[PDB]
Ligand binder design. Sequence first.
Ligand SMILES: [Mg+2]
Ligand SMILES: [Mg+2]
Ligand SMILES: [Mg+2]
Ligand SMILES: [Mg+2]
Ligand SMILES: [Mg+2]
Ligand SMILES: [Mg+2]
Ligand SMILES: [Mg+2]
Ligand SMILES: [Mg+2]
Ligand SMILES: [Mg+2]
Ligand SMILES: [Mg+2]
Ligand SMILES: [Mg+2]
Ligand SMILES: [Mg+2]
Ligand SMILES: [Mg+2]
Ligand SMILES: [Mg+2]
Ligand SMILES: [Mg+2]
Ligand SMILES: [Mg+2]
Ligand SMILES: [Mg+2]
Ligand SMILES: [Mg+2]
Ligand SMILES: [Mg+2]
Ligand SMILES: [Mg+2]
Ligand SMILES: [Mg+2]
Ligand SMILES: [Mg+2]
Ligand SMILES: [Mg+2]
Ligand SMILES: [Mg+2]
Ligand SMILES: [Mg+2]
Ligand SMILES: [Mg+2]
Ligand SMILES: [Mg+2]
Ligand SMILES: [Mg+2]
Ligand SMILES: [Mg+2]
Ligand SMILES: [Mg+2]
Ligand SMILES: [Mg+2]
Ligand SMILES: [Mg+2]
Ligand SMILES: [Mg+2]
Ligand SMILES: [Mg+2]
Ligand SMILES: [Mg+2]
Ligand SMILES: [Mg+2]
Ligand SMILES: [Mg+2]
Ligand SMILES: [Mg+2]
Ligand SMILES: [Mg+2]
Ligand SMILES: [Mg+2]
Ligand SMILES: [Mg+2]
Ligand SMILES: [Mg+2]
Ligand SMILES: [Mg+2]
Ligand SMILES: [Mg+2]
Ligand SMILES: [Mg+2]
Ligand SMILES: [Mg+2]
Ligand SMILES: [Mg+2]
Ligand SMILES: [Mg+2]
Ligand SMILES: [Mg+2]
Ligand SMILES: [Mg+2]
Ligand SMILES: [Mg+2]
Ligand SMILES: [Mg+2]
Ligand SMILES: [Mg+2]
Ligand SMILES: [Mg+2]
Ligand SMILES: [Mg+2]
Ligand SMILES: [Mg+2]
Ligand SMILES: [Mg+2]
Ligand SMILES: [Mg+2]
Ligand SMILES: [Mg+2]
Ligand SMILES: [Mg+2]
Ligand SMILES: [Mg+2]
Ligand SMILES: [Mg+2]
Ligand SMILES: [Mg+2]
Ligand SMILES: [Mg+2]
Ligand SMILES: [Mg+2]
Ligand SMILES: [Mg+2]
Ligand SMILES: [Mg+2]
Ligand SMILES: [Mg+2]
Ligand SMILES: [Mg+2]
Ligand SMILES: [Mg+2]
Ligand SMILES: [Mg+2]
Ligand SMILES: [Mg+2]
Ligand SMILES: [Mg+2]
Ligand SMILES: [Mg+2]
Ligand SMILES: [Mg+2]
Ligand SMILES: [Mg+2]
Ligand SMILES: [Mg+2]
Ligand SMILES: [Mg+2]
Ligand SMILES: [Mg+2]
Ligand SMILES: [Mg+2]
Ligand SMILES: [Mg+2]
Ligand SMILES: [Mg+2]
Ligand SMILES: [Mg+2]
Ligand SMILES: [Mg+2]
Ligand SMILES: [Mg+2]
Ligand SMILES: [Mg+2]
Ligand SMILES: [Mg+2]
Ligand SMILES: [Mg+2]
Ligand SMILES: [Mg+2]
Ligand SMILES: [Mg+2]
Ligand SMILES: [Mg+2]
Ligand SMILES: [Mg+2]
Ligand SMILES: [Mg+2]
Ligand SMILES: [Mg+2]
Ligand SMILES: [Mg+2]
Ligand SMILES: [Mg+2]
Ligand SMILES: [Mg+2]
Ligand SMILES: [Mg+2]
Ligand SMILES: [Mg+2]
Ligand SMILES: [Mg+2]
Ligand SMILES: [Mg+2]
Ligand SMILES: [Mg+2]
Ligand SMILES: [Mg+2]
Ligand SMILES: [Mg+2]
Ligand SMILES: [Mg+2]
Ligand SMILES: [Mg+2]
Ligand SMILES: [Mg+2]
Ligand SMILES: [Mg+2]
Ligand SMILES: [Mg+2]
Ligand SMILES: [Mg+2]
Ligand SMILES: [Mg+2]
Ligand SMILES: [Mg+2]
Ligand SMILES: [Mg+2]
Ligand SMILES: [Mg+2]
Ligand SMILES: [Mg+2]
Ligand SMILES: [Mg+2]
Ligand SMILES: [Mg+2]
Ligand SMILES: [Mg+2]
Ligand SMILES: [Mg+2]
Ligand SMILES: [Mg+2]
Ligand SMILES: [Mg+2]
Ligand SMILES: [Mg+2]
Ligand SMILES: [Mg+2]
Ligand SMILES: [Mg+2]
Ligand SMILES: [Mg+2]
Ligand SMILES: [Mg+2]
Ligand SMILES: [Mg+2]
Ligand SMILES: [Mg+2]
Ligand SMILES: [Mg+2]
Ligand SMILES: [Mg+2]
Ligand SMILES: [Mg+2]
Ligand SMILES: [Mg+2]
Ligand SMILES: [Mg+2]
Ligand SMILES: [Mg+2]
Ligand SMILES: [Mg+2]
Ligand SMILES: [Mg+2]
Ligand SMILES: [Mg+2]
Ligand SMILES: [Mg+2]
Ligand SMILES: [Mg+2]
Ligand SMILES: [Mg+2]
Ligand SMILES: [Mg+2]
Ligand SMILES: [Mg+2]
Ligand SMILES: [Mg+2]
Ligand SMILES: [Mg+2]
Ligand SMILES: [Mg+2]
Ligand SMILES: [Mg+2]
Ligand SMILES: [Mg+2]
Ligand SMILES: [Mg+2]
Ligand SMILES: [Mg+2]
Ligand SMILES: [Mg+2]
Ligand SMILES: [Mg+2]
Ligand SMILES: [Mg+2]
Ligand SMILES: [Mg+2]
Ligand SMILES: [Mg+2]
Ligand SMILES: [Mg+2]
Ligand SMILES: [Mg+2]
Ligand SMILES: [Mg+2]
Ligand SMILES: [Mg+2]
Ligand SMILES: [Mg+2]
Ligand SMILES: [Mg+2]
Ligand SMILES: [Mg+2]
Ligand SMILES: [Mg+2]
Ligand SMILES: [Mg+2]
Ligand SMILES: [Mg+2]
Ligand SMILES: [Mg+2]
Ligand SMILES: [Mg+2]
Ligand SMILES: [Mg+2]
Ligand SMILES: [Mg+2]
Ligand SMILES: [Mg+2]
Ligand SMILES: [Mg+2]
Lengths: 124, 156, 63
Amino acid sequence: ARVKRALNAQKKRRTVLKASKGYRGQRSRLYRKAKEQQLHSLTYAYRDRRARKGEFRKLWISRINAAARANDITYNRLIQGLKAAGVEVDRKNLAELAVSDPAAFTALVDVARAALPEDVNAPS
Amino acid sequence: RGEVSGGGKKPYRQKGTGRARQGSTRAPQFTGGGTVHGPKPRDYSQRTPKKMIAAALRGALSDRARNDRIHAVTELVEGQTPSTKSAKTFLGTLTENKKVLVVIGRTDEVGAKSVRNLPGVHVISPDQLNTYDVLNADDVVFSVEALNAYISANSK
Amino acid sequence: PKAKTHSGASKRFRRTGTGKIVRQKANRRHLLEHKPTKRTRRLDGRTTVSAADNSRINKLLNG
RNA sequence: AAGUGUUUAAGGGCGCAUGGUGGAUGCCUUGGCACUGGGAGCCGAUGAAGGACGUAGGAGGCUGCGAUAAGCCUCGGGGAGCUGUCAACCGAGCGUUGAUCCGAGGAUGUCCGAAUGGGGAAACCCGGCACGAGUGAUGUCGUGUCACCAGGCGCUGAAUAUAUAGGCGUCUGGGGGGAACGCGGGGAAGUGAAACAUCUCAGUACCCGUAGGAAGAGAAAACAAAAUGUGAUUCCGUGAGUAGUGG
RNA sequence: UCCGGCUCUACCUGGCUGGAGGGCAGUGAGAAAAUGUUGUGGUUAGCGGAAAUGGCUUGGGAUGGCCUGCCGUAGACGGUGAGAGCCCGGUACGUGAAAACCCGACGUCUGUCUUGAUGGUGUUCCCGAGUAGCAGCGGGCCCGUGGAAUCUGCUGUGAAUCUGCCGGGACCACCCGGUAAGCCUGAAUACUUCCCAGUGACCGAUAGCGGAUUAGUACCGUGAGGGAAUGGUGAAAAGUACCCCGGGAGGGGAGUGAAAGAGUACCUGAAACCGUGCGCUUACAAUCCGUCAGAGCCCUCGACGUGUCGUGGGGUGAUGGCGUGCCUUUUGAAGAAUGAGCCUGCGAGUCAGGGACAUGUCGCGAGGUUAACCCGGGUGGGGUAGCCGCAGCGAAAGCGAGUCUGAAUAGGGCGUAUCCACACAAGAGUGUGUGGUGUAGUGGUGUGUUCUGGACCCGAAGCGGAGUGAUCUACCCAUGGCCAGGGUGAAGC
RNA sequence: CAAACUCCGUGAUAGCUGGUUCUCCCCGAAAUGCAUUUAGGUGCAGCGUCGCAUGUUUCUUGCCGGAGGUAGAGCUACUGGA
RNA sequence: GGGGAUAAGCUCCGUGCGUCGAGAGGGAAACAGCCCAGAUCGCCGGCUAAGGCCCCUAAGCGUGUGCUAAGUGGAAAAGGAU
RNA sequence: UUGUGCGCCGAUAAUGUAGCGGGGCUCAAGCACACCGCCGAAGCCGCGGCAGCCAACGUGUUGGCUGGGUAGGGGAGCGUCCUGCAUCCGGUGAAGCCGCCGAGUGAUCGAGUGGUGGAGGGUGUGGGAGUGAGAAUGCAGGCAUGAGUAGCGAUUAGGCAAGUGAGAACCUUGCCCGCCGAAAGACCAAGGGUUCCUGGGCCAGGCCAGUCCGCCCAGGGUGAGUCGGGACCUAAGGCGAGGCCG
RNA sequence: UACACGGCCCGUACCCCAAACCAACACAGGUGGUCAGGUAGAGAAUACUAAGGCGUACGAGUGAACUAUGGUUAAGGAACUC
RNA sequence: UCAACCAUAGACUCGGCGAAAUUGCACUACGAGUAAAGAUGCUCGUUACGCGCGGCAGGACGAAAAGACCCCGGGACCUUCAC
RNA sequence: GUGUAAGUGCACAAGGGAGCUUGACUGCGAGACGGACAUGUCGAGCAGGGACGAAAGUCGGGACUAGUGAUCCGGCACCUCU
Ligand SMILES: [Mg+2]
Ligand SMILES: [Mg+2]
Ligand SMILES: [Mg+2]
Ligand SMILES: [Mg+2]
Ligand SMILES: [Mg+2]
Ligand SMILES: [Mg+2]
Ligand SMILES: [Mg+2]
Ligand SMILES: [Mg+2]
Ligand SMILES: [Mg+2]
Ligand SMILES: [Mg+2]
Ligand SMILES: [Mg+2]
Ligand SMILES: [Mg+2]
Ligand SMILES: [Mg+2]
Ligand SMILES: [Mg+2]
Ligand SMILES: [Mg+2]
Ligand SMILES: [Mg+2]
Ligand SMILES: [Mg+2]
Ligand SMILES: [Mg+2]
Ligand SMILES: [Mg+2]
Ligand SMILES: [Mg+2]
Ligand SMILES: [Mg+2]
Ligand SMILES: [Mg+2]
Ligand SMILES: [Mg+2]
Ligand SMILES: [Mg+2]
Ligand SMILES: [Mg+2]
Ligand SMILES: [Mg+2]
Ligand SMILES: [Mg+2]
Ligand SMILES: [Mg+2]
Ligand SMILES: [Mg+2]
Ligand SMILES: [Mg+2]
Ligand SMILES: [Mg+2]
Ligand SMILES: [Mg+2]
Ligand SMILES: [Mg+2]
Ligand SMILES: [Mg+2]
Ligand SMILES: [Mg+2]
Ligand SMILES: [Mg+2]
Ligand SMILES: [Mg+2]
Ligand SMILES: [Mg+2]
Ligand SMILES: [Mg+2]
Ligand SMILES: [Mg+2]
Ligand SMILES: [Mg+2]
Ligand SMILES: [Mg+2]
Ligand SMILES: [Mg+2]
Ligand SMILES: [Mg+2]
Ligand SMILES: [Mg+2]
Ligand SMILES: [Mg+2]
Ligand SMILES: [Mg+2]
Ligand SMILES: [Mg+2]
Ligand SMILES: [Mg+2]
Ligand SMILES: [Mg+2]
Ligand SMILES: [Mg+2]
Ligand SMILES: [Mg+2]
Ligand SMILES: [Mg+2]
Ligand SMILES: [Mg+2]
Ligand SMILES: [Mg+2]
Ligand SMILES: [Mg+2]
Ligand SMILES: [Mg+2]
Ligand SMILES: [Mg+2]
Ligand SMILES: [Mg+2]
Ligand SMILES: [Mg+2]
Ligand SMILES: [Mg+2]
Ligand SMILES: [Mg+2]
Ligand SMILES: [Mg+2]
Ligand SMILES: [Mg+2]
Ligand SMILES: [Mg+2]
Ligand SMILES: [Mg+2]
Ligand SMILES: [Mg+2]
Ligand SMILES: [Mg+2]
Ligand SMILES: [Mg+2]
Ligand SMILES: [Mg+2]
Ligand SMILES: [Mg+2]
Ligand SMILES: [Mg+2]
Ligand SMILES: [Mg+2]
Ligand SMILES: [Mg+2]
Ligand SMILES: [Mg+2]
Ligand SMILES: [Mg+2]
Ligand SMILES: [Mg+2]
Ligand SMILES: [Mg+2]
Ligand SMILES: [Mg+2]
Ligand SMILES: [Mg+2]
Ligand SMILES: [Mg+2]
Ligand SMILES: [Mg+2]
Ligand SMILES: [Mg+2]
Ligand SMILES: [Mg+2]
Ligand SMILES: [Mg+2]
Ligand SMILES: [Mg+2]
Ligand SMILES: [Mg+2]
Ligand SMILES: [Mg+2]
Ligand SMILES: [Mg+2]
Ligand SMILES: [Mg+2]
Ligand SMILES: [Mg+2]
Ligand SMILES: [Mg+2]
Ligand SMILES: [Mg+2]
Ligand SMILES: [Mg+2]
Ligand SMILES: [Mg+2]
Ligand SMILES: [Mg+2]
Ligand SMILES: [Mg+2]
Ligand SMILES: [Mg+2]
Ligand SMILES: [Mg+2]
Ligand SMILES: [Mg+2]
Ligand SMILES: [Mg+2]
Ligand SMILES: [Mg+2]
Ligand SMILES: [Mg+2]
Ligand SMILES: [Mg+2]
Ligand SMILES: [Mg+2]
Ligand SMILES: [Mg+2]
Ligand SMILES: [Mg+2]
Ligand SMILES: [Mg+2]
Ligand SMILES: [Mg+2]
Ligand SMILES: [Mg+2]
Ligand SMILES: [Mg+2]
Ligand SMILES: [Mg+2]
Ligand SMILES: [Mg+2]
Ligand SMILES: [Mg+2]
Ligand SMILES: [Mg+2]
Ligand SMILES: [Mg+2]
Ligand SMILES: [Mg+2]
Ligand SMILES: [Mg+2]
Ligand SMILES: [Mg+2]
Ligand SMILES: [Mg+2]
Ligand SMILES: [Mg+2]
Ligand SMILES: [Mg+2]
Ligand SMILES: [Mg+2]
Ligand SMILES: [Mg+2]
Ligand SMILES: [Mg+2]
Ligand SMILES: [Mg+2]
Ligand SMILES: [Mg+2]
Ligand SMILES: [Mg+2]
Ligand SMILES: [Mg+2]
Ligand SMILES: [Mg+2]
Ligand SMILES: [Mg+2]
Ligand SMILES: [Mg+2]
Ligand SMILES: [Mg+2]
Ligand SMILES: [Mg+2]
Ligand SMILES: [Mg+2]
Ligand SMILES: [Mg+2]
Ligand SMILES: [Mg+2]
Ligand SMILES: [Mg+2]
Ligand SMILES: [Mg+2]
Ligand SMILES: [Mg+2]
Ligand SMILES: [Mg+2]
Ligand SMILES: [Mg+2]
Ligand SMILES: [Mg+2]
Ligand SMILES: [Mg+2]
Ligand SMILES: [Mg+2]
Ligand SMILES: [Mg+2]
Ligand SMILES: [Mg+2]
Ligand SMILES: [Mg+2]
Ligand SMILES: [Mg+2]
Ligand SMILES: [Mg+2]
Ligand SMILES: [Mg+2]
Ligand SMILES: [Mg+2]
Ligand SMILES: [Mg+2]
Ligand SMILES: [Mg+2]
Ligand SMILES: [Mg+2]
Ligand SMILES: [Mg+2]
Ligand SMILES: [Mg+2]
Ligand SMILES: [Mg+2]
Ligand SMILES: [Mg+2]
Ligand SMILES: [Mg+2]
Ligand SMILES: [Mg+2]
Ligand SMILES: [Mg+2]
Ligand SMILES: [Mg+2]
Ligand SMILES: [Mg+2]
Ligand SMILES: [Mg+2]
Ligand SMILES: [Mg+2]
Ligand SMILES: [Mg+2]
Ligand SMILES: [Mg+2]
Ligand SMILES: [Mg+2]
Ligand SMILES: [Mg+2]
């Protein structure tokens, strides 16, 4: 029973086109070559869906370093003192505070410095 | 490709043309060509063991009986008078089901030739009772002659 | 097209009772002088085919 | 004085609403495909199959028809509607007595076409013979008949003596076309064999001559195997991919 | 039964032909030609053939939705303004042919023969000749010379006629079985250019026949031959009176119509493609053109006033992080290796077989199942013809839970389905004897693989058979035509 | 034109080249040997998969029993070589 | 290890070698085969390997002890040099 | 002299530094040695989700693990067409088209809808398939770009007046100019067959416009005893009764 | 010879070195026979002209390259170049 | 040597009609390096306002033809004391 | 030194001589080695007969490892096969 191949093909044509909506030039017009960049753009989606966490943690660390230096301490020392004091706050909250409440950031850095041992070069 | 009529020649030279290499005006990929796999006249009979069919009938009838869709009757319509109105009155009084199946001794012709018109009713002599009809019908009714002959055939 | 058998094989094998195919020992037709009887002694008396080639042959006999 | 700073779009891109071209998609069937049960299995010298030309009140085309040209008679079925279609339209018109429409028999059937009077580039040239007619007669006109082969019959008979060949004239047949099937004469390669000759492909395709609706085959000089067996041909399913055949 | 004439004549016994009467049958394959016609048989065309204006609603239009009632031996089918048995064509059913034609009998008339027929005791030129068979050569039977019968035939040869022949798979004997060289003869079977009636898990316009349409046309080729594309307005033409722009085309009004974003380029109108407009972006920017972030602007929505919040959206996207298309075949490609201009349709593991096997699964079970075929306008019933396993071993004779090997208990090869408990050995691993558990295959249905078929799809150079061409060219054949003008000056005289 | 053209056998045959279309879930190769008119093909065994069966027989280490004849070393030890 | 010249991204073997093939991630700028390490999916969480911590670019312009003057680091020998 | 760690020379290429990736770095951001740190992946851990295998118990939960993957094997599905069905959906709008929303892990789905469309679709469970396209220099159709680019088809060549007409270089008439003139003139044969003339209009055709045309539309037009082909005869050659051979 | 009679059918248009034929086109090609003026010249070459027909269907404007068709060139005269 | 000028038809601008090959993409620079081993597309650094018109051809391994040569599975034709 | 190269072995001889004589037997073969497969190698014991040695025992070819050829078609001999 010969089946005429119209509706099925058009469904997927339109679905791919819609998913490609908003691309450049003919790339949102020609299905034979929208597929190329639907597939690509989604490959990038897959990869950066994790790349984003790395990038954001990088930005947070940079902001924290800036805040620590403005408060006269280096980021690594801030982290070391904070850990040695056994705080459980992470760098996302660190950065958000550092840009929101400099007073609280100052208090936290004092806590870190106080928890910082006397000698930093001790072999023990 | 072998039966499509005409042009059994190479459409054009092999090399130098710059088009695709072709070898028939009727290739399945060309337009107006033949079909890749041409079907042929064909039969769909499947052979089912006699025990297969007998067991299927026994099962179907057992289920129908458990459902209580069988009856008995001495006669259906008065003789020498095929009258669809009489048949319809009889069936309406008897059953409230629109569609039923009836089995009769073959020789009774008035009943069949009279009640044959309706689309919701069917009549079959029990030599030709079959699984598909039994299943399709909501109910079945066995005349005395038909029930007797069919049961004796079963037990013989 | 009832499946052609292979008359070139049936003249060479026989089906055992459990499904294996018995084959006859080769390398005896001629030049038997410097073949010593001891060599031939395990060389007469048919034997079953190896489980390796049986696959092809089974597809051969009944074809 | 300084440094800080939007402010425009010739065009372009992206979306959104509008449209334009191109005609897929969905839906339709007078068309095709494949079958079943029937019918018919031929048509042709009484001129076939298929064509040219013509044929209408209307210019072309298709359908029918054939100088008697969308047709004519006779017999039977129907009727108040008809003068086929493109295509309409008109215009003329036809019917209660029954016109057209459908069926049966009949006549009509130009020309080419086996073409058959001779010839020929198909639808076109050119004649002989018998009977009538018109012209002052001729001119002229119609009608018919006029091939070949086969088989017979009557007449004739060369070399020549008999007789025969040949020669005439007359009856009866055949001549060509058609999808397959059937018979018969002939009859290959690509291919497989992993090459290739034997071999295979296969007595297939194809060519040719026959008839028929079927044909062909058909009444054992067959098998069988001690049974005091089968009993024409043909076609099915087995027996069986078995016995066998084969670089 | 009788009559006559004959076997060169007339008078007993024996062998034939012709005529008066029972046969054999006949349009016949076995005698030939003639003699003529009845079926409500069919065909060619036809007639009747039931039952709602029913009402209301949407509705342009009803067959539609609801309510009643309808008829049906007819609820196949088509059409009519949307789904109709109660509207029409028509359907079951009934009926019918003046004339002609294909299939079935019956009284004129025709032939024959009863000069022929049936049953019973012994001795002495016919029934298929250049045939059977033969030597050589080849052909068809599964049979390719092989040990090769049977058949046919090309060439040479060549038989017997009953105590004859030829076959019985080299070939011979006893016997065993059937008549060659002459002939014909229905039924079963194959096919469908043609016609009718019905049907389809067949297509629905790039499908389906090449061809739903002026199609084997246009067109291509001088030829043989090839060979197209091209359907739909509407229910109905009611196909756009009239007005206006323009020369017209074209267009806008007006009207038709339910719809004119149905107007003849006419249903639906998509995507590539080309525009208008709107919001946003862009003229310091180096690049598979996106993704992750991301301000701004535009618009949108709710709590909250003039814009701020809010588990906010869509469009845009300034800027920055990462970022070398896709398929191929390859060790390996961003690849400067291949293919793709784009879009839309079409395009590729199908199909048959008691084909074979295995796995699922279904029925029965030491049984499983039927083919063809016959009869039910229907898949039923019958049909055990057949095939597989129940036992294998051996090449075979043959043997048989053993068998083969072999001179062999003497173990080995292959099976005894397969195991449990008891005893005997070595503990060369296991073998040898007892009592029980007792053997599982077969036919569907679907699936992978194999099988022969073109066998997943397109593609070649080429070989062969049948035909079409010497209107160009090659050659030649016959008949015509062509070669302005001006020089040189042989022989001969 | 190194065998004209059209039709037909003809779906000639192609170990060669191209292409082979909807989603998900599970396991997961080799480019080896042998043989091959075989080397760019094919078949057998290894390598994967699914099922069934034996259910650890497999794996790692420790210890034990083992034979080597390599690196190295040696040469009035041989064969050579200085 | 053979061949080649201890040359080739060379060829031919062995590796119960590894990886790519048939593997995404990070590092060596870029780079399958080198180093670290096995991507069921999502999370705007944390700890780490290799490699890194002045800026491009996340991390000490860190601690202490020495060397170097050559931009050696950030291409190379025989030999030569208070 | 010796052993040492660093150094220096030894040191020449080709498009542009181009032999730290670059800036830059000795007041090392270099090298060697130790320490503490900190960054650094899809590794591990953290939270939520899905699925496979496995064990226990039950009549599908708990717990242990594994889940990248080409050739390839296995398992389970989505969707299309057409059949069977209880029979329904729909002119109060089916299919189809274009949007929007929500939902499934996927193929998708929605008795889910907005606008066009105005006549058919079909739940469920089976059954059968011409069943799913991006590629094959695929086929047919449509439309792209090079691009408003190249070309507009000779060597003879025009200007102008007036007329028609909406428009006039291109047509009609007139004046001059140029070109062929053994043709670029005039007759025929072969060939083509209405291209001849007249009248009307200019969509399509003419490589532009076009009143013009060899356009289309209608009408008209071809007059033979003496020219030509048959009545005559024949060449080359073809056909061929009988005949010969196959 | 006075005589009045009697002679078919078919072609007859147009083009026919061309926008009408053969070349897919209104194409710088091919196509057979006949007619053959005047002045120069041997003439059927060539140059200009009558008879007669044409300017064969894109135009208008711009001193660029550069290409093609051509003309001229100081001095040298094959030194280029196979 | 050593080209110069000039008259012609194009090339150019304006009006008219209006093509072809090719084409996966396109918001398409440079150099050194890297790499399937000669990069517009990777790294690094340099330079560069967006867009045209006339030209010139070095690259875009530019276009045309599934490479002739070579080799590999096969054809045809031809030669001969190959069968 | 040990029939024919090299390696492996060999004085308990596998090295010579002699005597005798045929086991360079017949049918099987526990189990193994190698083989992708066809094949290829080793082998204690069982039955008849024989050989050497009184006997013990050894004897199924050469000290081993190369000296080889599948299938078809055919030829020849024997048989308690048809
Ligand atoms: Mg965007
Ligand atoms: Mg095709
Ligand atoms: Mg077709
Ligand atoms: Mg056989
Ligand atoms: Mg032998
Ligand atoms: Mg021997
Ligand atoms: Mg195997
Ligand atoms: Mg006609
Ligand atoms: Mg009548
Ligand atoms: Mg009649
Ligand atoms: Mg008649
Ligand atoms: Mg008549
Ligand atoms: Mg004739
Ligand atoms: Mg005739
Ligand atoms: Mg006669
Ligand atoms: Mg005589
Ligand atoms: Mg005949
Ligand atoms: Mg072969
Ligand atoms: Mg082969
Ligand atoms: Mg053959
Ligand atoms: Mg044969
Ligand atoms: Mg007949
Ligand atoms: Mg017969
Ligand atoms: Mg049989
Ligand atoms: Mg009637
Ligand atoms: Mg209503
Ligand atoms: Mg109703
Ligand atoms: Mg209803
Ligand atoms: Mg109906
Ligand atoms: Mg209806
Ligand atoms: Mg009606
Ligand atoms: Mg034979
Ligand atoms: Mg014989
Ligand atoms: Mg006889
Ligand atoms: Mg006979
Ligand atoms: Mg019959
Ligand atoms: Mg359509
Ligand atoms: Mg032609
Ligand atoms: Mg209205
Ligand atoms: Mg249209
Ligand atoms: Mg429409
Ligand atoms: Mg923009
Ligand atoms: Mg800017
Ligand atoms: Mg950059
Ligand atoms: Mg980019
Ligand atoms: Mg990036
Ligand atoms: Mg980048
Ligand atoms: Mg590869
Ligand atoms: Mg790759
Ligand atoms: Mg490129
Ligand atoms: Mg490539
Ligand atoms: Mg390439
Ligand atoms: Mg390649
Ligand atoms: Mg390309
Ligand atoms: Mg193209
Ligand atoms: Mg099968
Ligand atoms: Mg089964
Ligand atoms: Mg069973
Ligand atoms: Mg039955
Ligand atoms: Mg046997
Ligand atoms: Mg034996
Ligand atoms: Mg025994
Ligand atoms: Mg099936
Ligand atoms: Mg041929
Ligand atoms: Mg000829
Ligand atoms: Mg002289
Ligand atoms: Mg030809
Ligand atoms: Mg054919
Ligand atoms: Mg064939
Ligand atoms: Mg082919
Ligand atoms: Mg093949
Ligand atoms: Mg390829
Ligand atoms: Mg895995
Ligand atoms: Mg264990
Ligand atoms: Mg040791
Ligand atoms: Mg050493
Ligand atoms: Mg030493
Ligand atoms: Mg020594
Ligand atoms: Mg090495
Ligand atoms: Mg290599
Ligand atoms: Mg891996
Ligand atoms: Mg990787
Ligand atoms: Mg990296
Ligand atoms: Mg993982
Ligand atoms: Mg950067
Ligand atoms: Mg930083
Ligand atoms: Mg540090
Ligand atoms: Mg410091
Ligand atoms: Mg120090
Ligand atoms: Mg350096
Ligand atoms: Mg140095
Ligand atoms: Mg020194
Ligand atoms: Mg020192
Ligand atoms: Mg220095
Ligand atoms: Mg650096
Ligand atoms: Mg840390
Ligand atoms: Mg991470
Ligand atoms: Mg993990
Ligand atoms: Mg668990
Ligand atoms: Mg997986
Ligand atoms: Mg691969
Ligand atoms: Mg796979
Ligand atoms: Mg569906
Ligand atoms: Mg509606
Ligand atoms: Mg609507
Ligand atoms: Mg709707
Ligand atoms: Mg509508
Ligand atoms: Mg539907
Ligand atoms: Mg179903
Ligand atoms: Mg289903
Ligand atoms: Mg398909
Ligand atoms: Mg497509
Ligand atoms: Mg693909
Ligand atoms: Mg394509
Ligand atoms: Mg191309
Ligand atoms: Mg273009
Ligand atoms: Mg230009
Ligand atoms: Mg130009
Ligand atoms: Mg021109
Ligand atoms: Mg004018
Ligand atoms: Mg001139
Ligand atoms: Mg001249
Ligand atoms: Mg002249
Ligand atoms: Mg002519
Ligand atoms: Mg003519
Ligand atoms: Mg004219
Ligand atoms: Mg006019
Ligand atoms: Mg006009
Ligand atoms: Mg035109
Ligand atoms: Mg006209
Ligand atoms: Mg004749
Ligand atoms: Mg006269
Ligand atoms: Mg005439
Ligand atoms: Mg004339
Ligand atoms: Mg004329
Ligand atoms: Mg002329
Ligand atoms: Mg033409
Ligand atoms: Mg022209
Ligand atoms: Mg021309
Ligand atoms: Mg000429
Ligand atoms: Mg002249
Ligand atoms: Mg002149
Ligand atoms: Mg003139
Ligand atoms: Mg130029
Ligand atoms: Mg020049
Ligand atoms: Mg001069
Ligand atoms: Mg000079
Ligand atoms: Mg110069
Ligand atoms: Mg010009
Ligand atoms: Mg120019
Ligand atoms: Mg120019
Ligand atoms: Mg143009
Ligand atoms: Mg490099
Ligand atoms: Mg590059
Ligand atoms: Mg480079
Ligand atoms: Mg430019
Ligand atoms: Mg480049
Ligand atoms: Mg180049
Ligand atoms: Mg190229
Ligand atoms: Mg080639
Ligand atoms: Mg080759
Ligand atoms: Mg040839
Ligand atoms: Mg010895
Ligand atoms: Mg010795
Ligand atoms: Mg054994
Ligand atoms: Mg003994
Ligand atoms: Mg022994
Ligand atoms: Mg030995
Ligand atoms: Mg020995
Ligand atoms: Mg052989």
